[PDB]
RNA sequence: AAUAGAUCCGUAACUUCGGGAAAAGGAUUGGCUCUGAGGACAUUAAUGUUAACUCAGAACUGAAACGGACAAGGGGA
RNA sequence: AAAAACCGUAAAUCCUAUCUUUUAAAGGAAGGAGAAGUCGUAACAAGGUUUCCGUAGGUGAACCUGCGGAAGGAUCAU
RNA sequence: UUCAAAGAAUCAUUCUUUUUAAAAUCCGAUUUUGUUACUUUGAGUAAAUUAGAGUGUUCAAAGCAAACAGUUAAAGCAUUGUGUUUGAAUACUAUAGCAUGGAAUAACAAAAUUGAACAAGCU
RNA sequence: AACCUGGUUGAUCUUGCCAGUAGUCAUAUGCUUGUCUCAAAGAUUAAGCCAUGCAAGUGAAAGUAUAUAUAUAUAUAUGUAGAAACUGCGAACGGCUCAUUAAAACAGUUAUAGUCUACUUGACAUUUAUAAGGAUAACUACGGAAAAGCUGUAGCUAAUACUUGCAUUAUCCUUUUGGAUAAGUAUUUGUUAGAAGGAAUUAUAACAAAGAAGUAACACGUAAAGUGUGUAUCAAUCGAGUUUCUGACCUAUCAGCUUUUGAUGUUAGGGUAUUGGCCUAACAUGGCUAUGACGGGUAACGGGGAAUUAGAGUUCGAUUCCGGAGAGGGAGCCUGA
């Protein structure tokens, strides 16, 4: 037959998964869920190859059996569960909270997060639908459906979704001064203020983003994520703060120690 | 005058009883022809009148034959780069396009077409705008950089 | 059953590999006669059920000038734009012309307006005699081989005039 | 003795390019009920009156039979 | 449920035709190689009839002859 | 078929900036002025392989790791315990397609037995 | 490392090829072989034929247990397990091979405003009830056949197997409150109005008809109320089918092909998950071609890639990954997302 493929070859795995060639012939195919396979990482990899808590898949299963790891404050027990771009995974045993982010290089890194920030996740809206009764519902990057959004929320906006109540608290627009983070581009993981946008009739829309050091980089509209206004980010960025350094000064300031 | 088939041509979507001719604005910067605005024809595959929608890509070409009913043949000329000899070579490809009766298409005038859903075994494009172009010789023979 | 095994655009024939897949499919037609209502069920792709009607005698038919639909029984199919063996063998297809019992429509007109929304429309004269005979002309609008029922609408105006000329400078 | 009418299809070597050729070799054919096409004539773009048998197609039908008798090439190297 | 009929999908077998590849063959006619074989002397010298071309005919063979060309000639020249 | 002119910065030069026709936009000033080829920049660029950064697998082929104090404790941080620092870069991914700056070189377009623009009156 | 050398002659300078030279993740083979590391391996020809054995099964809270075994206070109420069997899910992934295949497949680039989509994830629902019905496996006993994943008759019983079936909400008026009014999820038909897209016959809404399938007659237990299983629709996700543009080797001693028998297009329909000559009927005569159509050949699966490379190039790519195809050769079909 020709049904859905259910295996993932090790070399065919996404690059940011960052697995070794000789470490077996297969990679864990993420179960279908809230995030795309390419745009996410299974929690098996998250806490075997990143947190190093478990050194085999079986120990990953042993961890997951105890309802101790919660993705967005709800217990998850699927080994190949897609965690996705930004969300709060809380481990109760060590009482630690990680918000998943990108880095300037473009891999998925857990970021240590305090309790007050761990109940406060960001969701980039992707679609605005209206169902029966003229009730509007937002489809977010998280694969989440939020009914009864404010009318002022637009298609590309980003809402602060509270983890417990699942309700939006406030939304951020996509003006030319809005802080943004690139999610899949050549400049994945970069953070900037959106210098400008341009609308292409019937084709991809490009936006040019200004860095902290006045560095302009362009990207497609489909893979940007508003993370705040001009004032400041609404989350805590990793140690590079989303500032991608050039290949020269990166070596230069790595050398000095 | 207009009903020449052994079926009633209706222009589905026109509305006939309550309301307050049907046409749409196709988009992509193309203007709906006044002939489509105020015409009497009915064409189920017309971009501005029928059920089809223009999505995909836009091309331009030279009309090679208009002897099919509401369907014309467009030749696209282009240069293909032969790397070994570091120079180009003339090549062509002709694509069939549906032509609405709102357009008076002759032999050798450049038309622009937009991709639509498969309308026949070979038609996947529909003309959007016609610009008259005087021709000399055989349109198949002549070469236009478009 | 679809998409191959035939000449190219140029006229050349294509050597065939990739024998027939299930998703090409192509089930046999449903020559829907008129008679006692009977419908079979066909399991299409993805377990979506389709209702293959074999015989119908009634259906929902609409008064489009008034925009009101009433269920009624069809009498006889008298024209179809396609091959005219379908009318002779009395099959129901998407847009064939049939005859409809007009009594439900006349009764509805009486109970709503009286006298033998968007009210006071003055109808048309040419449909009056067709009503008075008792049987009216309608065009099917559903696909009985797909939805399992034969719905339609009364034809009037120049469309009715066109079909009237096409059926009966005439034989 | 073998078909042999007609319709549709297909037709080689060779050739003086004209033929060979009805090459060879296939299929169909009744009856019935229908459908389509092919004309002429007058009135104020539209409506009526009327003729020929000739083709094409579809159902149904029968002890699979139908150029039913009559008539009527055997081909090829 | 058996069973049957009808459209449809249609394996498979057979007939016919065409094409492709391989292959037998009396006889015919080439080419190449081998050896001190037989017959002549065609070409290279003006090669003992200058050589060669196209064409045509003839002859044991190389070849000969006619017609028109070329010098790659044996003439750069009263 | 728009040529050109004038000014700041290294060495003697080289390099940077401004305006100079016409039509619409802003009360003397606020600003766009064919198409394509071509060329420049980007976006999408699966990995393995390739080039290539780092990394003493005892070297190398490799691999993507690893490194650091610590005869067992200082230091960092937490208001008593908790190891720490990291790397897995970058480029290529047609010639075609998307967007993009463009002055040169190439084509095509418009251009008269005519074809305009403006002003006034008329519909 | 951007390289040349021997060979025509008595001798010379050329053209010109033969030979030499080096590499090959390129095969075979000969001789020889003390260590360690690394690791290709029935592709070439026979997608030839196969003995034998294995290669897809699955129950740790959570469908169904008087097969049966066990343990707690005293024949009781709890449990612990549990062969077989019914039910559920998977077996459509994976693995192998490269025969077919020459604008086909494949690759980059699009579209799906022309569609389907199990598991998983997020939202969220409409026209006897102190809990409804028969019928069956396992099993029991009587059997048949040399043999098989063969099964006959009679008797019971379960189930999350199969099948029936039980409030309420919203709206208008005086104007917290009292009165009054209305009630189908997809899908199909007819008549209308109309946050987003580039463009809607879009979302959605109104009226008139139909109308599936459902909304728990189900099982275990988390804060010092949860879960599992199942279910309508939408969305996401894992995918898929079609689809735009561009790109391929040799051959003209293949120049005209296609078109009754669909060839190109129109109209109407049928069919499909959807578009489409995909198919049917009527109609028109179109469509491709020296910029190589149509044929023929390939000891041709395509690509990522490999060898050789100064730069160009030339040759290879069955074979780690991706896509395609196939299971002796064809065809047909059931279950199922």
XYZ file of N, CA, C and O (backbone and C1' of nucleotides) in Angstrom, chain G residues 287-329:
301
model
P -5.750 24.511 -33.575
O -4.980 23.407 -32.738
C -5.296 23.175 -31.377
C -4.565 21.966 -30.870
C -3.098 21.902 -31.246
O -2.277 22.666 -30.386
C -4.113 19.848 -31.753
P -0.972 23.388 -30.965
O 0.040 22.192 -31.199
C 0.607 21.513 -30.097
C 1.513 20.405 -30.552
C 2.615 20.800 -31.515
O 3.726 21.406 -30.889
C 1.548 18.877 -32.318
P 4.549 22.539 -31.666
O 5.307 21.743 -32.812
C 6.229 20.716 -32.496
C 6.707 20.012 -33.736
C 7.325 20.897 -34.799
O 8.662 21.252 -34.514
C 5.793 19.432 -35.811
P 9.178 22.734 -34.836
O 10.672 22.510 -35.321
C 11.003 21.394 -36.135
C 12.433 21.453 -36.596
C 12.802 22.713 -37.361
O 14.187 22.982 -37.162
C 13.046 20.846 -38.773
P 14.666 24.414 -36.622
O 14.354 24.370 -35.066
C 15.076 23.510 -34.194
C 14.505 23.538 -32.799
C 13.061 23.063 -32.686
O 12.852 22.434 -31.421
C 13.208 25.305 -31.976
P 13.372 20.939 -31.138
O 12.104 20.008 -31.384
C 11.386 20.038 -32.613
C 11.238 18.663 -33.213
C 11.839 17.526 -32.396
O 11.071 16.343 -32.591
C 12.921 17.648 -34.494
P 10.849 15.319 -31.377
O 9.269 15.238 -31.232
C 8.516 16.365 -30.815
C 7.200 16.431 -31.540
C 6.463 15.111 -31.665
O 5.695 14.815 -30.516
C 6.555 16.159 -33.774
P 5.762 13.361 -29.846
O 5.424 12.378 -31.041
C 4.118 12.314 -31.584
C 4.084 11.373 -32.752
C 4.724 10.021 -32.506
O 3.850 9.119 -31.860
C 5.552 10.916 -34.520
P 4.443 7.903 -31.006
O 5.121 6.979 -32.102
C 6.308 6.270 -31.810
C 7.022 5.860 -33.067
C 8.266 5.021 -32.856
O 7.972 3.654 -32.651
C 8.771 6.779 -34.324
P 8.487 2.921 -31.324
O 9.975 2.507 -31.689
C 10.269 1.943 -32.955
C 11.736 2.039 -33.270
C 12.679 1.718 -32.130
O 12.839 0.331 -31.914
C 13.387 3.691 -33.186
P 13.046 -0.223 -30.425
O 14.502 0.277 -30.037
C 15.629 -0.133 -30.791
C 16.889 0.513 -30.287
C 17.150 0.377 -28.802
O 17.696 -0.880 -28.460
C 17.551 2.601 -29.479
P 17.301 -1.570 -27.071
O 18.084 -0.711 -25.991
C 19.489 -0.560 -26.073
C 19.968 0.540 -25.169
C 19.469 0.479 -23.741
O 20.185 -0.450 -22.952
C 19.254 2.680 -24.553
P 19.406 -1.604 -22.155
O 20.016 -1.524 -20.689
C 20.650 -2.643 -20.094
C 22.151 -2.537 -20.178
C 22.698 -1.218 -20.702
O 22.792 -0.224 -19.697
C 23.725 -3.001 -21.850
P 22.894 1.330 -20.089
O 21.456 1.679 -20.662
C 20.291 1.395 -19.908
C 19.844 2.586 -19.110
C 18.854 2.288 -18.009
O 19.493 1.765 -16.863
C 18.140 4.182 -19.218
P 18.633 1.126 -15.678
O 18.158 2.401 -14.864
C 17.110 2.300 -13.927
C 16.115 3.412 -14.084
C 16.579 4.783 -13.616
O 17.319 5.498 -14.587
C 14.534 4.284 -12.594
P 18.379 6.616 -14.132
O 17.485 7.829 -13.629
C 17.042 8.832 -14.528
C 16.427 9.996 -13.795
C 17.353 10.749 -12.859
O 18.167 11.693 -13.526
C 15.364 10.252 -11.722
P 19.658 11.970 -13.009
O 19.444 12.731 -11.631
C 18.823 14.004 -11.607
C 18.413 14.403 -10.214
C 19.529 14.558 -9.202
O 20.243 15.769 -9.332
C 17.776 13.339 -8.232
P 21.794 15.815 -8.940
O 21.784 15.789 -7.351
C 21.078 16.770 -6.612
C 21.069 16.444 -5.143
C 22.431 16.254 -4.507
O 23.048 17.481 -4.176
C 21.003 14.499 -3.846
P 24.630 17.646 -4.344
O 25.214 16.349 -3.641
C 26.465 15.817 -4.031
C 26.438 14.314 -4.054
C 27.670 13.655 -4.644
O 28.722 13.526 -3.713
C 25.763 12.753 -5.662
P 30.222 13.859 -4.160
O 30.629 12.615 -5.060
C 30.663 11.308 -4.516
C 31.211 10.326 -5.513
C 32.485 10.754 -6.217
O 33.644 10.498 -5.452
C 30.936 9.998 -7.814
P 34.958 11.383 -5.679
O 35.547 10.840 -7.050
C 35.952 9.488 -7.182
C 36.400 9.192 -8.587
C 37.412 10.159 -9.171
O 38.736 9.884 -8.758
C 35.688 9.806 -10.729
P 39.753 11.091 -8.485
O 39.965 11.742 -9.918
C 40.605 11.018 -10.955
C 40.391 11.673 -12.291
C 40.913 13.090 -12.430
O 42.307 13.153 -12.661
C 38.723 12.981 -13.283
P 43.268 13.896 -11.611
O 43.312 15.405 -12.116
C 42.390 16.364 -11.622
C 41.547 16.945 -12.731
C 41.759 18.421 -13.031
O 42.883 18.665 -13.854
C 39.444 17.977 -12.873
P 44.124 19.504 -13.282
O 43.541 20.971 -13.084
C 43.781 21.681 -11.882
C 43.733 23.174 -12.085
C 42.418 23.747 -12.576
O 41.484 23.912 -11.528
C 44.224 24.725 -13.759
P 39.913 23.781 -11.814
O 39.646 24.840 -12.966
C 39.589 26.229 -12.684
C 39.227 27.003 -13.920
C 38.014 26.480 -14.663
O 36.804 26.963 -14.117
C 39.782 26.790 -16.187
P 35.489 26.054 -14.168
O 34.951 26.279 -15.642
C 34.577 25.178 -16.445
C 34.839 25.457 -17.898
C 34.177 24.502 -18.868
O 32.821 24.824 -19.098
C 36.436 24.743 -19.452
P 31.689 23.723 -18.833
O 31.654 22.899 -20.188
C 31.613 21.485 -20.173
C 32.880 20.892 -20.729
C 32.878 19.380 -20.857
O 32.288 18.953 -22.068
C 34.854 20.078 -19.770
P 31.012 17.987 -22.050
O 31.642 16.543 -21.863
C 32.583 16.044 -22.796
C 33.291 14.832 -22.258
C 32.402 13.772 -21.640
O 31.807 12.925 -22.600
C 34.210 14.206 -20.201
P 30.347 12.327 -22.336
O 30.585 11.220 -21.221
C 31.366 10.073 -21.503
C 31.774 9.352 -20.246
C 30.652 8.876 -19.344
O 30.010 7.703 -19.800
C 32.296 9.911 -18.035
P 28.489 7.424 -19.376
O 28.575 7.122 -17.816
C 29.213 5.948 -17.345
C 29.339 5.942 -15.844
C 28.044 5.903 -15.058
O 27.451 4.621 -15.012
C 29.471 7.507 -14.112
P 25.857 4.487 -14.913
O 25.507 5.123 -13.498
C 25.905 4.481 -12.299
C 25.423 5.227 -11.085
C 23.939 5.517 -11.025
O 23.175 4.400 -10.627
C 25.132 7.451 -10.429
P 21.671 4.236 -11.149
O 21.404 2.679 -11.010
C 20.094 2.149 -11.082
C 19.973 0.926 -10.217
C 20.266 1.144 -8.745
O 19.153 1.643 -8.032
C 21.492 -0.706 -9.506
P 19.328 2.895 -7.051
O 20.345 2.368 -5.953
C 20.027 1.245 -5.149
C 21.211 0.822 -4.324
C 21.836 1.909 -3.473
O 21.142 2.097 -2.257
C 23.529 0.724 -4.620
P 20.481 3.514 -1.907
O 20.554 3.563 -0.322
C 21.730 3.141 0.351
C 21.668 3.451 1.821
C 20.979 4.764 2.169
O 20.359 4.638 3.444
C 23.218 4.841 2.892
P 18.768 4.758 3.580
O 18.477 6.285 3.263
C 18.613 7.272 4.269
C 18.297 8.639 3.726
C 17.043 8.728 2.880
O 15.868 8.840 3.656
C 18.813 9.790 1.754
P 14.467 8.330 3.070
O 14.135 9.381 1.930
C 13.857 10.731 2.254
C 13.574 11.539 1.018
C 12.549 10.949 0.073
O 11.218 11.151 0.495
C 14.417 11.651 -1.161
P 10.126 10.010 0.233
O 9.859 10.105 -1.328
C 9.331 11.294 -1.886
C 9.339 11.255 -3.389
C 8.770 10.007 -4.032
O 7.359 9.978 -4.053
C 10.795 10.555 -5.076
P 6.596 8.571 -4.012
O 6.937 7.908 -5.416
C 6.434 8.465 -6.617
C 6.923 7.714 -7.827
C 6.579 6.241 -7.879
O 5.251 6.003 -8.296
C 8.839 6.536 -8.462
P 4.374 4.901 -7.540
O 4.656 3.566 -8.355
C 4.709 3.573 -9.771
C 5.622 2.492 -10.282
C 5.386 1.111 -9.702
O 4.358 0.425 -10.377
C 7.688 1.616 -9.640
P 3.273 -0.402 -9.549
O 3.942 -1.832 -9.379
C 4.398 -2.552 -10.510
C 5.318 -3.673 -10.110
C 4.858 -4.520 -8.941
O 3.918 -5.502 -9.327
C 7.131 -3.950 -8.662
P 2.911 -6.125 -8.250
O 3.701 -7.379 -7.683
C 4.296 -8.314 -8.571
C 5.450 -9.035 -7.926
C 5.060 -10.093 -6.905
O 6.032 -11.133 -6.922
C 6.338 -8.420 -5.847
P 5.564 -12.663 -6.953
O 6.101 -13.210 -8.343
C 7.436 -12.978 -8.755
C 7.624 -13.376 -10.193
C 6.705 -12.684 -11.183
O 7.167 -11.403 -11.563
C 6.637 -14.996 -11.568
P 6.118 -10.258 -11.954
O 5.455 -10.795 -13.292
C 6.185 -10.847 -14.505
C 5.247 -11.027 -15.663
C 4.107 -10.028 -15.706
O 4.479 -8.849 -16.390
C 3.252 -12.222 -15.923
